[PDB]
């Protein structure tokens, strides 16, 4: 009712013309079940950090979304997963990139925050650190789905001829947190890293300003520091969350050649879900209220 | 049209009492040579991008500094190297992290920038990318020094960077590191992260950072300087003051940064005992520094 959660399952050319209602409902129902889990945790007095971690863990678990189970395939038919989490109370943050044997990247990220002096770990060393703290080793086949494999095959075909998930929360104690997780991009060059695991690019939170989670053209979200730039425009520029969101997602990012969106909640409990794309899988709801879910523009 | 360069070789616990004057002179000569190389380039009308790339290349080559040759050792006696470069005319950026078989990380980062659609590459994928563009594979033992190895043995009980404003009015920045003595393998500090260890924008400022990596990331120090100026309207001096002297210590962070704004203002703030640093205007005599004055 000031406490609030927003989530996303990625932005993109998701085309209304090519979907059925029954297909859309699978996404709507997953979104709804997850935002409600977050709502229920918020209403029960769980921390913003626990809320966004659980939300993103469930988005990972869900094969419909490009993170954890259901991750897109790289060029080499492998999966490389990245995630970030940030606690706006302490301003601490943890992130992992390029991991393949961890079932839940957002939990590894959180482990990096809480059980290390560090913010970011990568690759096998990240995995090794996580295993030593008792996180399970998984076979990388575990994330693999036929739906995404065919999208790899279709992208290869296109090439011969011619996004992330996230959560942001404001809890009952006035804490902001954000978390972002991704399976990558279809046909990705192995070892490439986007905005998702990068503090200030794909994920950012600060009690004094805003919590932000992004999904989009990774390279533009990095170069523009999209998540922090929301914080800075509000903080130093004096812009409202709405103005900050218009400036970044509707003007700046597309000027740089970037497409996607983000979700944002400010310390006053304003929430915004801008995207410049056709669709962004998204949901939000205040604690003690009915959630709203969406796919397309309005 | 004041072209200027600044460089650094790390901030930290530089204490008079552990250093000899001969050691200190070597640093002063190294700093002086590289800044002068950079200065001449700028006088000759070279791009800010080429200048900071060359400056950081020289610091990587120089075994005195923790970047490229003379990199610190991880916990596993390996070398993991990270670098970033950013062009303020375009906002394009290249970065590598966790590389072991590339001699000049700053050059791999530059290759990422110019010869891929990407900003950041990590590990063996970053190395394969670079090898396929014709960059040479080295044995990882070529960065090894006994100065650094003995420091690993002892521990069992910062970065380099450059910023420049060129004669065309362009800003660029680059940073490179060997990381940390006894580092947990896989850890990544601010150096390769756009906006944390490295940032450049013709509209505002070029920044290279060095210090407690984690804090520089959490506070987004490099970009925060630009943001404070661009949105807050702070002078380069005010911004450097807020970030380095106030916000970073508030978060438990130590280190410093080098910065040049679009008007030619140069700043080299740090909150540690020392920062290896140097700067100089085009057509002018360089200045170097280790401690404070
Ligand atoms: Cl809709
Ligand atoms: Cl001195
Ligand atoms: Na998933
Ligand atoms: Na060196």
Which string of DSSP letters, residue by residue, matches A253-268? HHHTT--EEEEEEETT
Question: Environment class of residue A45 by beta-carbon count within 10 Å: exposed (0-12), middle (13-18) or buried (19+)?
Answer: exposed
Q: For residue A48, give the nearest of A4, A9, A82, A83 by alpha carbon.
A: A4
Q: Which residues contact A209 (CB under 8 A, 6 or more apart)?
A: A88, A176, A230, A231, A234, A235, A266, A267
Q: For residue B95, give the nearest of B134, B121, B132, B127 by alpha carbon.
A: B121
Count of CB atoms situated within 10 Å of the CB of B119: 28
Resolution (A): 2.0
CA–chain centroid gap for A258, Å, is 17
Q: For residue B147, give the nearest of B73, B56, B57 by alpha carbon.
A: B73
Instruction: Compute the C-alpha angle B36/B41/B46, nearest 5°.
Output: 155
Q: For residue B158, give the nearest of B4, B279, B271 by alpha carbon.
A: B271
Contact B43, B134 (CB under 8 A): no
CA gap B247, B209 in Å, rounded = 14
Nearest CA in chain A to B219: A91
Quick check: B119 and A190 CB within 8 A?
Answer: no
Measure in Å the smallest separation between the Cα of B191 and chain A Cα atoms.
Answer: 12
Helix (H) or strand (E) holding A156: helix A146-161
Count of CB atoms situated within 10 Å of the CB of A257: 11
Quick check: A222 and B93 CB within 8 A?
Answer: yes
**Parallel, antiparallel or unpaired: strands A165-170 and A4-12:** antiparallel
Q: Report the C-alpha dihedral over residues B18, B21, B26, B29, rounded to 10 degrees.
A: 130
Quick check: A91 and B184 CB within 8 A?
Answer: no
Beta bridge partners of B85: B94, B174
Quick check: A92 and B218 CB within 8 A?
Answer: yes
DSSP letter string over B195-246?
A: TTTEEE-TTSEEEEEEE-HHHHHHTTHHHHHHHHHHTT---HHHHHIIIIII
CA gap A186, A168 in Å, rounded = 25
Helix (H) or strand (E) holding A237: none
DSSP reduced 3-state for B34: helix
Q: Which residues contact B135 (CB under 8 A, 6 or more apart)?
A: B102, B107, B108, B111
Tokens representing B104 are 């000049």
Question: Environment class of residue A155 by beta-carbon count within 10 Å: exposed (0-12), middle (13-18) or buried (19+)?
Answer: middle
Contact B123, A191 (CB under 8 A): yes
CA gap A51, A74 in Å, rounded = 30
Q: Which residues contact B171 (CB under 8 A, 6 or more apart)?
A: B48, B88, B89, B163, B164, B165, B200, B201, B202, B204, B205, B206, B260, B262
Q: For residue B34, give the nearest of B49, B52, B21 by alpha carbon.
A: B52
Measure in Å the smallest separation between the Cα of A115 and chain B Cα atoms.
Answer: 13
CA gap B261, B205 in Å, rounded = 4
Tokens representing A52 are 């966004």
List of chain B residues whose C-beta atoms are within 8 Å of the C-beta of residue A240: none
CA gap B205, B202 in Å, rounded = 6
**Parallel, antiparallel or unpaired: strands B205-211 and A271-272:** unpaired
**Parallel, antiparallel or unpaired: strands B120-122 and B92-99:** parallel
Nearest CA in chain B to A98: B122
Q: Which residues contact B276 (CB under 8 A, 6 or more apart)?
A: B8, B9, B10, B11, B14, B27, B31, B65, B289, B290
| Strand arrangement of the beta sheet that strand A176-182 belongs to | A120-122, A92-99, A81-87, A176-182, A165-170, A4-12, A279-286, A292-296
Q: Is the dihedral of CA B147, B149, B153, B159 positive or negative?
A: positive
CA gap A61, A104 in Å, rounded = 8
Which of B128, B217, B224 lies closest to A120 in CB terms? B217
Contact A76, A190 (CB under 8 A): yes
Phi first, then psi: give them for residue A80, nearest 5 degrees. -130, 115
- Residue B136 gets which letter from DSSP? P
Q: Ligand 4 being an ion, which residues bring their Cβ within 5 A of it?
A: B 60, 62, 65, 67-70
Tokens representing B269 are 């703030």
Tokens representing A238 are 């004096």
Quick check: B196 and A200 CB within 8 A?
Answer: yes
| A117 at interface of B, judged by CB pairs closer than 8 A | yes
Tokens representing B178 are 């060997």
Q: For residue A98, give the nearest of A131, A70, A74, A62 by alpha carbon.
A: A74
CA gap A229, A236 in Å, rounded = 10
Contact A161, A193 (CB under 8 A): no
- Residue A137 gets which letter from DSSP? B
CA–chain centroid gap for A178, Å, is 8
- Residue B139 gets which letter from DSSP? -
List of chain A residues whose C-beta atoms are within 8 Å of the C-beta of residue B120: 192-194, 198, 222
Helix (H) or strand (E) holding B176: strand B171-177
Measure in Å the smallest separation between the Cα of B20 and chain A Cα atoms.
Answer: 32
Elucidation method = X-ray
Output Rg (C-alpha) for chain B, integer angstroms.
Answer: 17
Count of CB atoms situated within 10 Å of the CB of A141: 8
Say what angle helices A105-115 and A48-61 make with each other, to 10 degrees.
Answer: 150
SS3 percent helix, strand, coil of chain A, rounded to 5, is 40, 25, 35
Distances (CA, A) of B68 to B5, B25, B124, B182: 21, 21, 17, 17
Q: Is the dihedral of CA B47, B48, B54, B57 positive or negative?
A: negative
Instruction: Compute the C-alpha angle B45/B49/B52, nearest 5°.
Output: 100
Q: For residue B183, give the nearest of B41, B85, B82 by alpha carbon.
A: B82
Contact B175, B159 (CB under 8 A): yes
Place of tokens 């740089």: A256
């Amino acid at each position: 009712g000031k406490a609030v959660i927003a989530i996303h399952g990625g932005a993109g050319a998701i085309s209304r013309a090519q979907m059925s209602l029954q297909q859309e409902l699978r996404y709507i129902e997953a979104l709804s079940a997850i935002v409600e889990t977050g709502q229920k945790m918020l209403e029960a007095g769980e921390s913003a950090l626990d809320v966004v971690t659980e939300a993103v863990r469930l988005l990972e678990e869900c094969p419909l979304f490009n993170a954890g189970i259901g991750a897109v395939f790289t060029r080499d038919e492998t999966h490389e997963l990245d995630a970030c989490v940030m606690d706006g109370n302490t301003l601490k943050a943890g992130a992992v990139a390029g991991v393949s044997h961890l079932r839940n990247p957002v939990l590894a990220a959180r482990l990096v925050m809480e059980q290390s002096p560090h913010v970011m770990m990568i690759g096998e060393g990240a995995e090794n650190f996580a295993f030593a703290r008792g996180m399970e080793r998984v076979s990388p086949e575990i994330f693999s789905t036929s739906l995404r494999y065919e999208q790899l095959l279709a992208a290869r075909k296109e090439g011969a001829t011619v996004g992330a998930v996230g959560a942001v929360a404001l809890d009952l104690d006035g804490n902001l947190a954000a978390a972002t997780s991704t399976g990558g991009m279809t046909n990705k060059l192995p070892g490439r890293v986007g905005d998702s695991p990068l503090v200030g690019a794909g994920c950012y939170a600060n009690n004094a300003s805003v919590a932000v989670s992004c999904t989009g053209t990774g390279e533009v979200f990095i170069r523009a520091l999209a998540a922090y730039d929301i914080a800075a425009l509000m903080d130093y520029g004096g812009l409202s969350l709405a103005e900050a969101c218009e400036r970044v997602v509707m003007e700046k990012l597309p000027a740089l050649g970037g497409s996607g969106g983000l979700i944002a909640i400010d310390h006053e409990g304003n929430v915004a879900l801008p995207f410049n794309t056709e669709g962004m899988y998204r949901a939000w709801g205040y604690a003690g209220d009915t959630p709203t879910t969406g796919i397309y523009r309005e």
